[PDB]
Amino acid sequence: CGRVRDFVAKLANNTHQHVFDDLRGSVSLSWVGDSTGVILVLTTFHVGQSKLYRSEDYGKNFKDITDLINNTFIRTEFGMAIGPENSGKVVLTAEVSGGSRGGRIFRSSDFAKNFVQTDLPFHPLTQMMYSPQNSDYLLALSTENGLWVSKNFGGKWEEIHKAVCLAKWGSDNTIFFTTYANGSCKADLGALELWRTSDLGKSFKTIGVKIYSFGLGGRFLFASVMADKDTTRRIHVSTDQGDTWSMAQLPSVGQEQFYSILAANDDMVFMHVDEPGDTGFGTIFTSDDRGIVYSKSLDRHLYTTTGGETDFTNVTSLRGVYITSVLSEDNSIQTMITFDQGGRWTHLRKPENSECDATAKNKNECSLHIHASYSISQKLNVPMAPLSEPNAVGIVIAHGSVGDAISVMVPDVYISDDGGYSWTKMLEGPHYYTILDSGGIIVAIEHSSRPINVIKFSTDEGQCWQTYTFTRDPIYFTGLASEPGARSMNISIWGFTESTSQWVSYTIDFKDILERNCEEKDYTIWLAHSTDPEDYEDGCILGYKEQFLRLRKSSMCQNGRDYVVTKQPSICLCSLEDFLCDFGYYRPENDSKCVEQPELKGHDLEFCLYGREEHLTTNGYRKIPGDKCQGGVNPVREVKDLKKKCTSNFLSPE
Ligand SMILES: *[C@@H]1O[C@H](CO)[C@@H](O[C@@H]2O[C@H](CO)[C@@H](O)[C@H](O)[C@H]2NC(C)=O)[C@H](O)[C@H]1NC(C)=O
Numbered sequence: 001c002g003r004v005r006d007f008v009a010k011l012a013n014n015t016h017q018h019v020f021d022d023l024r025g026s027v028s029l030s031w032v033g034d035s036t037g038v039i040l041v042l043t044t045f046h047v048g049q050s051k052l053y054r055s056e057d058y059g060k061n062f063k064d065i066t067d068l069i070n071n072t073f074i075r076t077e078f079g080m081a082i083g084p085e086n087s088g089k090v091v092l093t094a095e096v097s098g099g100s101r102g103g104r105i106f107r108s109s110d111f112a113k114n115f116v117q118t119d120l121p122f123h124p125l126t127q128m129m130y131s132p133q134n135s136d137y138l139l140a141l142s143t144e145n146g147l148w149v150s151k152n153f154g155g156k157w158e159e160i161h162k163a164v165c166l167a168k169w170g171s172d173n174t175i176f177f178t179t180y181a182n183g184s185c186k187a188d189l190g191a192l193e194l195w196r197t198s199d200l201g202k203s204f205k206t207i208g209v210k211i212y213s214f215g216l217g218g219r220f221l222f223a224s225v226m227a228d229k230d231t232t233r234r235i236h237v238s239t240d241q242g243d244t245w246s247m248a249q250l251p252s253v254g255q256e257q258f259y260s261i262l263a264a265n266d267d268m269v270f271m272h273v274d275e276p277g278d279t280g281f282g283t284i285f286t287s288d289d290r291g292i293v294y295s296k297s298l299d300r301h302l303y304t305t306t307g308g309e310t311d312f313t314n315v316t317s318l319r320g321v322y323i324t325s326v327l328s329e330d331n332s333i334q335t336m337i338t339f340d341q342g343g344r345w346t347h348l349r350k351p352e353n354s355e356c357d358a359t360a361k362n363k364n365e366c367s368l369h370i371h372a373s374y375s376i377s378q379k380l381n382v383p384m385a386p387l388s389e390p391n392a393v394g395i396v397i398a399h400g401s402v403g404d405a406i407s408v409m410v411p412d413v414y415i416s417d418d419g420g421y422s423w424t425k426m427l428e429g430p431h432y433y434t435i436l437d438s439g440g441i442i443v444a445i446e447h448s449s450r451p452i453n454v455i456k457f458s459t460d461e462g463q464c465w466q467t468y469t470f471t472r473d474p475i476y477f478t479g480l481a482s483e484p485g486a487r488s489m490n491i492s493i494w495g496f497t498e499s500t501s502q503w504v505s506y507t508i509d510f511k512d513i514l515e516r517n518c519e520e521k522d523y524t525i526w527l528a529h530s531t532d533p534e535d536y537e538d539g540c541i542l543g544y545k546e547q548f549l550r551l552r553k554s555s556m557c558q559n560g561r562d563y564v565v566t567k568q569p570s571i572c573l574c575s576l577e578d579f580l581c582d583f584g585y586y587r588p589e590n591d592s593k594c595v596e597q598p599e600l601k602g603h604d605l606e607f608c609l610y611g612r613e614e615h616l617t618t619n620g621y622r623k624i625p626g627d628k629c630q631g632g633v634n635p636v637r638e639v640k641d642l643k644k645k646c647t648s649n650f651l652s653p654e
Pocket residue numbers: 263264265266268269270314315316317319390
C-alpha cells in the first residue's frame with residue numbers, strides 16, 4: 001500500500017541508549033527551554049540520596065551532575081522549579097536539618113550548567129513561582145504562612161505579608177493573595193481578604209472581603225464571595241485586576257459544592273457549577289466576553305466529587321472543538337463533542353468500518369466514546385488520555401469505545417484528521433502515542449503486561465504504520481519523552497530491564513527517515529469545519545471560516561522546526577446564530593430569536609436585585625465571544641432597563 005523503504009538502516013545509527021545505573025524510586029524529568037535539548041532527570045532514594053543527570057542533545061546522552069548539588073537530598077514535593085520561556089532558570093529544593101532557621105535551595109540560571117546554593121530565611125511550603133513577566137522574580141509561602149518575594153532569582157527574600165492562604169502572579173508582575181485574621185485558612189474559610197500588590201510588597205489594595213477563594217483564567221480574575229448571614233457563596237468577576245467587581249450571572253452554591261474553571265481564554269470561560277448533593281456531575285456554563293453573562297451549555301457533566309476527575313478536553317488541533325463526558329439518566333457515561341465553543345453538543349460519529357459493541361442496543365447505529373481522566377481513574381486499561389497538538393492541524397488521537405456508552409473492555413486507539421468530525425481506528429489495543437514534527441511523524445508503543453522492544457511509526461497521519469526494533473534486550477515500558485511543542489524528531493523511550501533491575505532510555509532520531517524538507521508542492525488546501533461544500537456558509541464557525549495548507553498524507557517529508565501553520569480566514573455574514581441572549585432574554589422553541597422573559601426566576605431574580613447598572617440594562621442580544629462575523633443581521637432595539645421589571649412586584653419603602 002504505502003510504507004518507508006530501507007528504514008531499518010536510517011534508524012539504527014540514530015538509536016541512542018543510556019543506562020541510569022544508580023536509579024530507583026523517584027524519577028522527575030524536566031525540559032529546560034525550547035530548541036535547547038536540555039533535559040534534567042531527578043532520582044530520589046529512601047533509607048536518602050539524590051541523583052541528577054543532564055542532557056543537551058534531547059535525551060540521547062546524559063552526564064551525572066549530582067556533584068553540582070553537593071550530592072545532598074532533594075525534596076520532590078517541590079520538584080524542579082523551571083523558569084518560563086528560555087530563561088534557563090532551574091530551582092531545586094533541598095531537605096534540611098530538623099531545627100534549622102530556614103530551608104535551602106539550589107539555583108541555576110544558565111540551563112543547569114552551574115548551581116549556586118542559597119539558605120532561605122524561612123521554611124518553604126509551596127514550590128516557588130516565577131513571575132511570567134520577569135524570570136528573576138519569585139514568590140513562595142513559608143510553613144508559617146508568610147508571603148516571601150525575591151527580585152534577584154531567589155538570592156535575597158523579603159516577607160511582604162504574614163497571614164496568606166493562596167498567592168498568585170498576574171500579568172506585569174502583580175501578586176494576588178488571600179489573607180486570614182483569626183485562626184487559620186480553615187477557620188476563616190469564607191472570611192478571608194483578597195489583596196493585591198503591583199509594587200512587590202511596597203503597597204497593598206484590599207480588592208475583596210468575605211472571600212472563600214480566587215482564581216485567574218484568561219482576561220478574568222474570579223473570586224467566590226460568601227453570602228452575608230448565610231452558608232452559601234457565588235462568583236464575582238473583575239477584568240481590571242480587582243479595581244471593579246461584578247456579580248456573575250451564575251447559581252449560588254453551598255459548602256458541599258464547587259465552581260471549576262474548565263477552560264478560559266482572552267474571549268470567554270467554561271465554568272463547571274457543581275450539582276447540589278454528592279451527584280458526581282454538574283452543569284457547564286459558557287460566558288460572555290465580560291465573564292458576567294452565562295449561557296447553560298451542558299447538563300449532567302461528569303466531574304467527580306472525590307478526586308475531581310473530568311474528561312473535559314480542549315481539542316487544541318481545531319478551533320472551537322471540545323470533548324467531555326456526560327452522565328446519562330440510566331447511569332451510563334456518553335462522550336459529547338462541541339464544534340462551536342459549546343454552543344451545540346452532540347455524539348461523536350463512529351468510524352465507518354467499525355461495529356457496535358454490547359453496550360449498543362442497535363448493532364448498526366451508535367457513536368464513538370473517548371477514554372480520558374475519568375476512565376483512567378477507574379483503573380481501566382487506558383495508558384494515555386486524548387492527545388492533540390495545535391501545530392498538527394486536525395489530528396486527535398484517543399483510546400475509544402464504539403457503542404452507546406464508555407465500555408469497560410480493553411480499548412483500541414482512534415484517530416481523527418479533521419478535529420473530531422470523522423474517526424478511524426488507528427491501532428488495535430492500548431498504546432502510548434506522541435506527535436513529532438507538527439504531524440510529520442506519529443509514534444506508538446504497545447501497552448503490554450510483559451517487556452517490549454518495538455516502536456511503531458507513521459508518516460501519513462496514522463493511516464499506515466511501520467514496526468521498528470530499537471533494542472535486542474526488551475524493556476518494561478514506562479513512558480515517552482519528547483520536546484514540548486511537537487516540533488522535534490527526537491523521541492525518548494523509557495523503562496526498566498528484567499531483574500536487580502535498572503532504568504534505561506533509548507532515544508530515536510528521525511532526521512534520516514525524513515531526509516527531504518517539505519516544499520510548497522507537499523501542501524494541500526483544507527477548509528476546516530466542512531459539512532456541505534455546496535453551502536456558501538460551509539465552515540463558518542464563530543462567524544468565520546479558515547482555509548489551511550496541510551502536508552499531504554502521501555507527502556513524506558520534514559515540516560521543520562520553523563514550520564508555520566498557514567491559514568486564511570473568511571469573514572461570514574452575521575445571523576442571529578452569532579448572538580447569545582443577554583440578561584433577561586431567552587430562546588423559546590427551535591426559533592433563534594431572543595425574546596424577553598415573562599418574569600425572572602431562580603438566580604436570574606438573584607441577579608436582578610443585587611447586580612449593577614451596565615449588565616441590568618440590555619440590547620437583548622450580545623455577540624458570541626470569539627465571534628468575528630461582519631455585516632448581515634444586528635440586534636437593532638434601544639438599550640432597555642429591567643431594575644423596574646424585577647422590583648415591580650416588590651412593595652417599595654418610601
Ligand atoms: C483551546 O486551545 C486553543 C489552542 O491551544 C486556545 O487558543 C490559543 O489561545 C492563545 C491565547 O493566547 C492564542 O494566542 C492562540 O492563537 C490560540 N491558538 C489557536 C491555534 O487558535 C484556546 O484558547 C483554548 N480554549 C480555551 C477556552 O482556553
